[PDB]
Ligand binder design. Structure first.
Ligand SMILES: Nc1ncnc2c1ncn2[C@@H]1O[C@H](COP(=O)(O)OP(=O)(O)O)[C@@H](O)[C@H]1O
Ligand SMILES: Nc1ncnc2c1ncn2[C@@H]1O[C@H](COP(=O)(O)OP(=O)(O)O)[C@@H](O)[C@H]1O
Ligand SMILES: CC(C)(CO)[C@@H](O)C(=O)NCCC(=O)O
Ligand SMILES: CC(C)(CO)[C@@H](O)C(=O)NCCC(=O)O
Ligand code: NA
Ligand code: NA
Ligand code: NA
Ligand code: NA
Ligand code: NA
Ligand code: NA
Lengths: 307, 307
């Protein structure tokens, strides 16, 4: 039966790497991974390099499209010092490691002949402040589609891809568990913009951010494996993030492995799992590329959208 | 404020026509319009020709994209006697005249240097049979997303764009108000496929037909104007379609203008309007191009998606 996709396994996928050069040390790679992520240079070669290649082959082809319309409209060409920004979306569950995938991808792309300005933005900064979430009675739905100012988010990405000289985005603090007053991330006509978030790949009755993606990734893995990673990381943060007297979660630092496991599981069960099942997973079918990880966090299978 | 769209009016739009040649008579145009549609050659020049142009500028650019991926995958090029079919979607309310727009567009495109095989398919043939609709208790929701075998529909379009030599689709009879037993429409590796239907532009938790469109149209107009056209056409069919002793609607032929108006309005109010408001309209934001018609059925404004 015909299919819009093409499946792979490491063996098959690594061959699509070609001459694609490695321009990252085992050290730089380290400052790019999050607590719990395993990514090593091998994986960056057999997985992230082919990906980088494909993305590069597309940025060109994708440019033709905006040019065609530009030509149709009889517009004054298109300054190469400012093409239509290539937007890339990275979606997936909480704790699946999309922040690592996004960081590595960014580094790989910024390191390409001519040094493309490659900006990265997470949707965290588009969550409503805690005060506003409390007002809407959503302090326990952080991460759900409605906990986000999707209008501001859409406005942001639209601004950037429309060619704006610069756009601003609020900043989220994981330390304080809330939006930072007066903080902002300024993005200047990037060549590539990577938007990382839980629900970035979703659709609706209004034009959305996913309707502006030229390429998208969905970091996937088994729900039981991800819960495993979540709980695991929760216990591990008792001595990293939670250890800080300022962490909005400082009281967890003192929990016993047992107490911690109970607490972590409760959050997963009441917040992150429901959201994964009801909102995130239903968006996976549209990802240009799905990166399937195994219990060890390694990407061993990939699903590509050829159609 | 930046926008993904660009608005136009006839004046502005007709200028984008350029050398685009007219290859249709006032006679051929006639056998292409439906009861109630006004389209004349002027409109075909000031509106449909620019459209044809844009579409042509895109088919090329769009080809680069599949080639890029083909190249990425190290595939044996791509025979010009069989490129990736260009899929075009035409959506809109019942009675808004999308069947005319689809027919005219098809004719215009088939009449292009090298004579592209341009096939046209409506979603009518993907409705469940009346027997099956009665079973699901949906005999009064014909046209709603659930009255369609979306799996078969998706399979069909996927088959065609995936390069299949030929694909089949059931055939709907407006005369009998049901699917025709054993009837089928065979489509052979077209260069362009136009898919016309009510809900063709919608999304969901599964990859859909709208995810395969390379270009899409949304024939729009005011809901009161469309109801007007609907009722109007209903009365007019008393002596055309309904007049046939076989029409599943033959009893309406004998209605008085008054009775007819009452009946028509009831259907609009209980079926076609709800579906337009709940399912069709929410899809308009994604149309590559929106053709806005006035009470007289003429397209006087257009909204294009540049992003
Ligand atoms: N409570 C927390 N305190 C500090 N840092 C956190 C906390 N929760 C998550 N983080 C970090 O911020 C990012 C959150 O990742 P998550 O939201 O789990 O998405 P993912 O792991 O798929 O990138 C990761 O770097 C994670 O390690
Ligand atoms: N009851 C009917 N009997 C015969 N033909 C019909 C009937 N209803 C609609 N048609 C015709 O079949 C097509 C249905 O169009 P509709 O389903 O109203 O979409 P649109 O008018 O936007 O193309 C049009 O050609 C219409 O004239
Ligand atoms: C950024 C948060 C809070 C939400 O996006 C999430 O990434 C997280 O790390 N843990 C889930 C806890 C919560 O969502 O309340
Ligand atoms: C093809 C139908 C029936 C539905 O697609 C519709 O186009 C129509 O012409 N009139 C609405 C009547 C009904 O949908 O039952
Ligand atoms: Na941010
Ligand atoms: Na997308
Ligand atoms: Na690994
Ligand atoms: Na059909
Ligand atoms: Na579409
Ligand atoms: Na007209």
């Amino acid at each position: 039966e015909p299919s819009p996709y093409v499946e792979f396994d490491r063996r098959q996928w690594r061959a699509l790497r070609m001459s694609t050069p490695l321009a990252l040390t085992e050290e730089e790679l380290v400052g790019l991974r999050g607590l719990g992520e395993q990514i090593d240079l091998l994986e960056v070669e057999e997985v992230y390099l082919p990906l980088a290649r494909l993305i590069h082959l597309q940025v060109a082809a994708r440019q033709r499209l905006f040019a065609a319309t530009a030509e149709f409209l009889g517009e004054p060409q298109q300054n190469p010092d400012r093409p239509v920004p290539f937007i890339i979306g990275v979606a997936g569950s909480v704790a699946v490691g999309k922040s690592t995938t996004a960081r590595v991808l960014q580094a790989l792309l910024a390191r390409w002949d001519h040094h493309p300005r490659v900006d990265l933005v997470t949707t965290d900064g588009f969550l409503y402040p805690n005060a506003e979430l409390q007002r809407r009675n959503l302090m326990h739905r952080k991460g759900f589609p409605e906990s986000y100012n999707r209008r501001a988010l859409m406005r942001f990405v639209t601004s950037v891809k429309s060619g704006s000289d610069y756009a601003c985005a609020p900043v989220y603090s994981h330390l304080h568990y809330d939006i930072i007053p007066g903080a902002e991330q300024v993005v200047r006509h990037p060549d590539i913009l990577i938007l990382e978030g839980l629900n970035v790949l979703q659709t609706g009755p209004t034009l959305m951010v996913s309707d502006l993606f030229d390429f998208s990734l969905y970091v996937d893995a088994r729900i039981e494996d991800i819960e495993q990673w979540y709980v695991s990381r929760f216990l591990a943060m008792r001595t990293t993030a939670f250890a800080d007297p300022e962490s909005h979660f400082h009281h967890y630092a003192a929990f016993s492995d047992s107490q911690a496991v109970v607490a972590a599981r409760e959050i997963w069960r009441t917040i992150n799992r429901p959201n994964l099942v009801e909102n995130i997973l239903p968006t996976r079918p549209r990802a240009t590329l799905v990166l399937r990880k195994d219990a060890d966090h390694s990407i061993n299978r990939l699903r590509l959208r050829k159609l």
